[PDB]
Design an enzyme around this catalytic site. Structure first.
Site, PDB file in Angstrom:
ATOM      1  N   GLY B 149       0.865  -1.151   0.000  1.00 15.03           N
ATOM      2  CA  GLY B 149       0.000   0.000   0.000  1.00 15.03           C
ATOM      3  C   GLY B 149       0.907   1.208   0.000  1.00 15.03           C
ATOM      4  N   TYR B 155       9.843   2.725   2.442  1.00 11.45           N
ATOM      5  CA  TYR B 155      10.639   1.539   2.730  1.00 11.45           C
ATOM      6  C   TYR B 155      12.106   1.791   2.444  1.00 11.45           C
ATOM      7  CZ  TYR B 155       6.265  -0.719   3.560  1.00 11.45           C
ATOM      8  OH  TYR B 155       5.039  -1.008   4.123  1.00 11.45           O
ATOM      9  N   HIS B 161       9.251   3.348   7.662  1.00 16.28           N
ATOM     10  CA  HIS B 161       9.043   1.916   7.872  1.00 16.28           C
ATOM     11  C   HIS B 161      10.419   1.240   7.932  1.00 16.28           C
ATOM     12  CE1 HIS B 161       4.784   2.207   7.640  1.00 16.28           C
ATOM     13  NE2 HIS B 161       4.635   2.134   6.328  1.00 16.28           N
TER      14      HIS B 161
HETATM   15  C1  FAD Z   1      -3.931  -6.835   7.062  1.00 13.94           C
HETATM   16  C2  FAD Z   1      -3.249  -5.934   6.066  1.00 13.94           C
HETATM   17  C3  FAD Z   1      -1.940  -5.544   6.283  1.00 13.94           C
HETATM   18  C4  FAD Z   1      -1.248  -4.698   5.372  1.00 13.94           C
HETATM   19  N1  FAD Z   1       0.061  -4.385   5.683  1.00 13.94           N
HETATM   20  C5  FAD Z   1       0.750  -3.585   4.845  1.00 13.94           C
HETATM   21  C6  FAD Z   1       2.140  -3.259   5.157  1.00 13.94           C
HETATM   22  O1  FAD Z   1       2.710  -3.667   6.142  1.00 13.94           O
HETATM   23  N2  FAD Z   1       2.817  -2.436   4.283  1.00 13.94           N
HETATM   24  C7  FAD Z   1       2.186  -1.925   3.106  1.00 13.94           C
HETATM   25  O2  FAD Z   1       2.865  -1.216   2.414  1.00 13.94           O
HETATM   26  N3  FAD Z   1       0.899  -2.218   2.800  1.00 13.94           N
HETATM   27  C8  FAD Z   1       0.150  -3.033   3.619  1.00 13.94           C
HETATM   28  N4  FAD Z   1      -1.168  -3.341   3.305  1.00 13.94           N
HETATM   29  C9  FAD Z   1      -1.803  -2.800   2.057  1.00 13.94           C
HETATM   30  C10 FAD Z   1      -1.792  -3.904   0.958  1.00 13.94           C
HETATM   31  O3  FAD Z   1      -0.438  -4.270   0.746  1.00 13.94           O
HETATM   32  C11 FAD Z   1      -2.405  -3.387  -0.342  1.00 13.94           C
HETATM   33  O4  FAD Z   1      -3.759  -3.012  -0.120  1.00 13.94           O
HETATM   34  C12 FAD Z   1      -2.390  -4.496  -1.408  1.00 13.94           C
HETATM   35  O5  FAD Z   1      -1.045  -4.966  -1.692  1.00 13.94           O
HETATM   36  C13 FAD Z   1      -3.007  -3.957  -2.677  1.00 13.94           C
HETATM   37  O6  FAD Z   1      -2.998  -5.139  -3.746  1.00 13.94           O
HETATM   38  P1  FAD Z   1      -4.306  -5.552  -4.339  1.00 13.94           P
HETATM   39  O7  FAD Z   1      -3.897  -6.556  -5.457  1.00 13.94           O
HETATM   40  O8  FAD Z   1      -5.223  -6.048  -3.406  1.00 13.94           O
HETATM   41  O9  FAD Z   1      -4.900  -4.312  -4.844  1.00 13.94           O
HETATM   42  P2  FAD Z   1      -6.225  -3.860  -5.554  1.00 13.94           P
HETATM   43  O10 FAD Z   1      -6.736  -2.583  -4.942  1.00 13.94           O
HETATM   44  O11 FAD Z   1      -8.762  -1.286  -9.679  1.00 13.94           O
HETATM   45  O12 FAD Z   1      -5.822  -2.907  -6.595  1.00 13.94           O
HETATM   46  C14 FAD Z   1      -4.876  -2.176  -7.100  1.00 13.94           C
HETATM   47  C15 FAD Z   1      -5.397  -1.397  -8.334  1.00 13.94           C
HETATM   48  O13 FAD Z   1      -5.337  -2.301  -9.475  1.00 13.94           O
HETATM   49  C16 FAD Z   1      -6.577  -2.097 -10.244  1.00 13.94           C
HETATM   50  N5  FAD Z   1      -6.667  -3.363 -10.984  1.00 13.94           N
HETATM   51  C17 FAD Z   1      -7.338  -4.510 -10.616  1.00 13.94           C
HETATM   52  N6  FAD Z   1      -7.215  -5.488 -11.512  1.00 13.94           N
HETATM   53  C18 FAD Z   1      -6.433  -4.960 -12.510  1.00 13.94           C
HETATM   54  C19 FAD Z   1      -5.929  -5.533 -13.777  1.00 13.94           C
HETATM   55  N7  FAD Z   1      -6.182  -6.746 -14.179  1.00 13.94           N
HETATM   56  N8  FAD Z   1      -5.153  -4.683 -14.540  1.00 13.94           N
HETATM   57  C20 FAD Z   1      -4.866  -3.400 -14.151  1.00 13.94           C
HETATM   58  N9  FAD Z   1      -5.284  -2.797 -13.008  1.00 13.94           N
HETATM   59  C21 FAD Z   1      -6.064  -3.624 -12.218  1.00 13.94           C
HETATM   60  C22 FAD Z   1      -7.587  -1.832  -9.159  1.00 13.94           C
HETATM   61  O14 FAD Z   1      -8.762  -1.292  -9.694  1.00 13.94           O
HETATM   62  C23 FAD Z   1      -6.848  -0.873  -8.239  1.00 13.94           C
HETATM   63  O15 FAD Z   1      -7.026   0.508  -8.433  1.00 13.94           O
HETATM   64  C24 FAD Z   1      -1.947  -4.216   4.191  1.00 13.94           C
HETATM   65  C25 FAD Z   1      -3.304  -4.615   3.953  1.00 13.94           C
HETATM   66  C26 FAD Z   1      -3.966  -5.474   4.879  1.00 13.94           C
HETATM   67  C27 FAD Z   1      -5.388  -5.887   4.604  1.00 13.94           C
HETATM   68  O1  DTC Z   2      -1.331   2.552   1.774  1.00 17.00           O
HETATM   69  C1  DTC Z   2      -0.797   3.476   2.706  1.00 17.00           C
HETATM   70  O2  DTC Z   2      -1.316   4.807   2.695  1.00 17.00           O
HETATM   71  C2  DTC Z   2      -0.857   5.838   3.593  1.00 17.00           C
HETATM   72  C3  DTC Z   2      -1.462   7.181   3.500  1.00 17.00           C
HETATM   73  C4  DTC Z   2      -1.016   8.224   4.387  1.00 17.00           C
HETATM   74  C5  DTC Z   2       0.027   7.941   5.366  1.00 17.00           C
HETATM   75  C6  DTC Z   2       0.622   6.622   5.458  1.00 17.00           C
HETATM   76  C7  DTC Z   2       0.189   5.551   4.572  1.00 17.00           C
HETATM   77  C8  DTC Z   2       0.752   4.204   4.621  1.00 17.00           C
HETATM   78  O3  DTC Z   2       1.749   3.889   5.537  1.00 17.00           O
HETATM   79  C9  DTC Z   2       0.238   3.112   3.648  1.00 17.00           C
HETATM   80  C10 DTC Z   2       0.600   1.859   3.595  1.00 17.00           C
HETATM   81  C11 DTC Z   2       0.028   0.840   4.646  1.00 17.00           C
HETATM   82  C12 DTC Z   2      -1.418   0.294   4.595  1.00 17.00           C
HETATM   83  O4  DTC Z   2      -2.316   0.676   3.601  1.00 17.00           O
HETATM   84  O5  DTC Z   2      -1.857  -0.633   5.592  1.00 17.00           O
HETATM   85  C13 DTC Z   2      -0.983  -1.068   6.634  1.00 17.00           C
HETATM   86  C14 DTC Z   2      -1.457  -1.991   7.596  1.00 17.00           C
HETATM   87  C15 DTC Z   2      -0.588  -2.453   8.651  1.00 17.00           C
HETATM   88  C16 DTC Z   2       0.770  -1.980   8.736  1.00 17.00           C
HETATM   89  C17 DTC Z   2       1.274  -1.037   7.773  1.00 17.00           C
HETATM   90  C18 DTC Z   2       0.436  -0.559   6.710  1.00 17.00           C
HETATM   91  C19 DTC Z   2       0.899   0.378   5.722  1.00 17.00           C
HETATM   92  O6  DTC Z   2       2.219   0.862   5.783  1.00 17.00           O
END
Ligand code: FAD
Ligand code: DTC
Ligand code: FAD
Ligand code: DTC
Lengths: 273, 273
Positions: B149, B155, B161
């Protein structure tokens, strides 16, 4: 001070030394007046997988399901599943959170990991606007009590597995401190699978001896969030004043914030002397 | 060279970018002559919790249950849980194992962590006598394909982070490299939740490109097992001659082997130049 304490155990066998450790902590903590509450993941038959079943009712965007938003929404309007809500209740009330588990593949057992992904919902355990040291669980103190099969020297700097401090970081920093938790010195009980009886007995007693004053201990060190520019324009980078002032320092700040220099010895195992 | 690939997906939505990365990797790999086999953990309703029901047979010691010893025996004799045996069978066949998944709480999804713990059973995926480069999967190449995310600058060494390298260490050294796997550079796609539509397409495209010649690339660097005395006596410590010789190198060997020195830049992200 602390009154309530939550002990989260991750282990299937009751005959296990891990289970023994959990009892030892409840026994010892009660005696000092703490109100202990348990979370026997395996005994509770806890569900470690996040899914659109943790949200009860209609999702906001059923077509495009995004766990974060949905569960943040669900938390707000009270539609989280009873089991996730239950754990968030114990936590809300706990002052001290103990995590007891055997080290598996260099991390928390899958079921414990799942516990975090489901219980630690946004708004409840964290908000981007107040990550780390300014999080919600900042008034609480947490602790890892890990058991490992390997000797402690395998986890030493010259150890074939590498610095146990690197292994700890993703958990004590990434998961615990990211929510505001003050992280105490981890209770690492190495080579349990090769520890004699008398040695094992002493271990338990030590853990209890520690727990009688666990709350007055000085927590591990983590780079304050005041050292960063917590806005997206800066990309959440470390302030320019800080970056410059730190350049004369031989040691980095923490394992994660090493700055390509020398990591401070046991930054994740011992609290600042 | 490699003719068989196994793509392991850990995401519940088919509408997800991760799922799209999964299709891309196959469509690309197959087009170049590969035999792709997937393991969509969620779609499989895969059980991530290790228990005794993983062993359908007579446990050697049902009274004091121990997964390591019991799980291994099951593998030797052949009464492991059918589902696990099915997985392991996918791993004996693969030359390349791709792990597609959303970084969660600074690690792999619990379900994915469950997979390693149930499937990577001693004797099968590893043996103490053959730790790391001497492991059973030393002729296999693995790769983590992670999306996050948070913005890549978070990172960064200066990010709040911390060095992403430290976070990846536990997985690539601890889980994959321990079993013998040669770890290829992790395909990191930061803040996919903010990427513009055209870039998302490019990222998919790029992923497919690299895949074209993913097998000839040079793997991440790990301290060879030959730098350590590997006997419980010597403590599995880095040989003497070796220690003295490293006293002269400016940088540590790897993240978990920083030897108190500076960590070689992107040791867990970029191969050596
Ligand atoms: C419990 C938990 C812990 C997390 N911890 C972290 C963390 O420690 N560090 C961190 O950085 N993040 C963290 N996250 C955030 C998470 O990493 C992201 O939400 C996730 O990786 C997004 O991937 P996704 O494939 O689900 O996305 P999905 O939202 O329209 O989408 C990404 C985008 O791709 C688009 N899309 C979908 N399919 C396609 C396709 N075929 N072609 C082109 N575009 C497409 C979608 O519409 C979207 O806008 C956490 C989330 C959870 C639930
Ligand atoms: O997607 C993000 O949006 C943000 C917008 C404003 C300020 C900070 C953030 C973030 O750190 C992340 C990532 C992020 C997230 O979406 O979910 C998590 C859940 C557990 C632990 C860590 C994370 C993240 O670092
Ligand atoms: C899937 C998996 C992954 C693993 N990954 C790792 C890894 O990455 N790194 C690593 O180092 N190790 C790893 N291990 C090894 C694991 O960490 C150890 O086996 C585990 O931590 C041992 O804890 P235990 O309590 O379960 O031990 P249990 O075996 O009589 O027992 C230890 C001893 O405690 C004794 N005991 C029990 N209760 C008491 C009591 N009340 N008083 C006194 N003695 C008592 C038992 O009889 C036993 O001899 C892994 C194991 C598994 C199954
Ligand atoms: O208990 C042990 O016994 C040994 C005996 C002889 C030589 C080496 C070892 C070890 O490294 C460990 C620890 C150990 C273990 O018991 O299980 C694991 C599972 C996955 C990844 C790593 C590990 C370990 O390092």
């Amino acid at each position: 001070v602390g009154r309530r304490a939550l002990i989260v155990l991750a282990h299937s066998e009751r005959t296990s030394f891990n289970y023994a450790m959990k009892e030892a902590a409840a026994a010892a903590l009660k005696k000092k007046g703490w109100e202990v509450v348990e979370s026997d993941l395996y005994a509770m038959n806890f569900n470690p997988i996040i899914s659109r079943k943790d949200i009860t009712g209609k999702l906001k965007d059923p077509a495009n399901f995004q766990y974060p938003a949905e569960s943040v929404l669900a938390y707000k309007e009270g539609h989280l599943s009873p089991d996730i809500v239950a754990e968030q209740k114990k936590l809300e009330a706990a002052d001290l959170v103990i995590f007891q588990f055997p080290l598996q593949w260099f991390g928390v057992p899958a079921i414990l990991k799942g516990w975090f992904e489901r219980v630690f919902i946004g708004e409840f355990a964290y908000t981007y606007a107040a990550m780390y040291d300014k999080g919600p669980f900042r008034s609480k103190k947490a602790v890892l009590s890990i058991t490992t099969g390997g000797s402690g020297s395998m986890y030493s700097l010259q150890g074939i597995h590498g610095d146990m401090n690197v292994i700890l970081w993703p958990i004590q920093s990434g998961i615990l401190h990211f929510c505001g938790f003050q992280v105490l010195e981890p209770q690492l009980t190495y080579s349990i699978g090769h520890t004699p009886a008398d040695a094992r007995i002493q271990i338990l007693e030590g853990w209890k001896k520690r727990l009688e004053n666990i709350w007055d201990e000085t927590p591990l060190y983590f780079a304050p969030s005041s050292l960063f520019d917590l806005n997206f324009q800066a990309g959440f980078l470390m302030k320019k004043e800080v970056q410059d002032e730190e350049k004369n320092k031989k040691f980095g700040l923490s394992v994660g914030h090493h700055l390509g220099k020398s990591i401070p010895t046991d930054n994740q195992i011992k609290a600042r002397k």
